Design an enzyme around this catalytic site. Structure first.
Site, PDB file in Angstrom:
ATOM      1  N   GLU A  11      -2.856  -8.609  -5.029  1.00 20.18           N
ATOM      2  CA  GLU A  11      -1.479  -8.159  -5.110  1.00 20.18           C
ATOM      3  C   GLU A  11      -1.167  -7.498  -6.438  1.00 20.18           C
ATOM      4  OE1 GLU A  11      -0.306  -9.715  -1.333  1.00 20.18           O
ATOM      5  OE2 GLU A  11       0.506  -8.287  -2.744  1.00 20.18           O
ATOM      6  N   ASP A  20       6.108  -1.790  -1.868  1.00 22.40           N
ATOM      7  CA  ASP A  20       4.812  -2.196  -1.448  1.00 22.40           C
ATOM      8  C   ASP A  20       4.103  -1.134  -0.595  1.00 22.40           C
ATOM      9  OD1 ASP A  20       5.472  -4.784   1.115  1.00 22.40           O
ATOM     10  OD2 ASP A  20       5.617  -2.631   1.113  1.00 22.40           O
ATOM     11  N   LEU A  32       7.860 -10.207  -1.664  1.00 23.17           N
ATOM     12  CA  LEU A  32       8.774  -9.312  -0.928  1.00 23.17           C
ATOM     13  C   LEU A  32      10.256  -9.629  -1.165  1.00 23.17           C
ATOM     14  CD1 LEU A  32       9.246  -7.150   1.140  1.00 23.17           C
ATOM     15  CD2 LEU A  32       9.388  -9.006   2.751  1.00 23.17           C
ATOM     16  N   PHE A 104       0.031 -15.250   3.318  1.00 23.74           N
ATOM     17  CA  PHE A 104       0.846 -14.778   2.237  1.00 23.74           C
ATOM     18  C   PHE A 104       1.196 -13.277   2.436  1.00 23.74           C
ATOM     19  CE2 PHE A 104       1.960 -15.261  -2.257  1.00 23.74           C
ATOM     20  CZ  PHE A 104       2.019 -13.911  -2.684  1.00 23.74           C
ATOM     21  N   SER A 117      -9.251 -14.127  17.097  1.00 27.40           N
ATOM     22  CA  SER A 117      -9.949 -14.315  15.828  1.00 27.40           C
ATOM     23  C   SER A 117      -9.851 -15.784  15.430  1.00 27.40           C
ATOM     24  CB  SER A 117      -9.328 -13.551  14.666  1.00 27.40           C
ATOM     25  OG  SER A 117      -9.273 -12.171  14.925  1.00 27.40           O
ATOM     26  N   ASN A 132     -13.952  -9.027  15.157  1.00 24.44           N
ATOM     27  CA  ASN A 132     -12.653  -9.014  15.790  1.00 24.44           C
ATOM     28  C   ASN A 132     -11.473  -8.770  14.810  1.00 24.44           C
ATOM     29  OD1 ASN A 132     -10.068 -10.877  17.032  1.00 24.44           O
ATOM     30  ND2 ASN A 132     -11.322  -9.758  18.518  1.00 24.44           N
TER      31      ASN A 132
END
Length: 164
Positions: A11, A20, A32, A104, A117, A132
């Site tokens: 990040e 972002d 965010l 996250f 998955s 996948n």
């Protein structure tokens, strides 16, 4: 390496409101603020989050505080989620970090949507699950970060990040 260092690599750290990859108003370490288009709405969310008038800017300390809350909230959310908990419990310590990173980034709901998955991870079919997971908007939109996470699930080691 640990969850915090991993996420800090993915990040970055920005002390001024920024947009972002999806165009949303964020600050700190991937925190965010709002999906709304108004910088004003973002500045407001920010002051509400910090408890001061920030005027769009925060300190290192504030950024780290938000980061601690977010990681904590990501973990608690996995633990509370019926679809995620069983997977998380089945995993080793490194792979657990990979699941936390997805949550996250994309929220509980988003990851919980990766039904197939999730099933493969639970079954410990590493190679199948890596293939996948790559078939997603996630992977097409942020391929370098997705590859890092995917490699982590595939190998159960921190190689993808020992570069970085």
């Amino acid at each position: 390496m640990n969850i915090f260092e991993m996420l800090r690599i993915d990040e970055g750290l920005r002390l001024k409101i920024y947009k972002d990859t999806e165009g949303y108003y964020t600050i700190g370490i991937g925190h965010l603020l709002t999906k709304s288009p108004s910088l004003n709405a973002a500045k407001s969310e920010l002051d509400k989050a910090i408890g001061r008038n920030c005027n769009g800017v925060i300190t290192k300390d504030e950024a780290e505080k938000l980061f601690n809350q977010d990681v904590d909230a990501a973990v608690r959310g996995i633990l509370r989620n019926a679809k995620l908990k069983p997977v998380y419990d089945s995993l080793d310590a490194v792979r657990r970090c990979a699941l936390i990173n997805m949550v996250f980034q994309m929220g509980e709901t988003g990851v919980a949507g990766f039904t197939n998955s999730l099933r493969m991870l639970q079954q410990k079919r590493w190679d199948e699950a890596a293939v996948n997971l790559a078939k997603s908007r996630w992977y097409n939109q942020t391929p370098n970060r997705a590859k890092r996470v995917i490699t982590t699930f595939r190998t159960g080691c921190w190689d993808a990040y020992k570069n970085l």
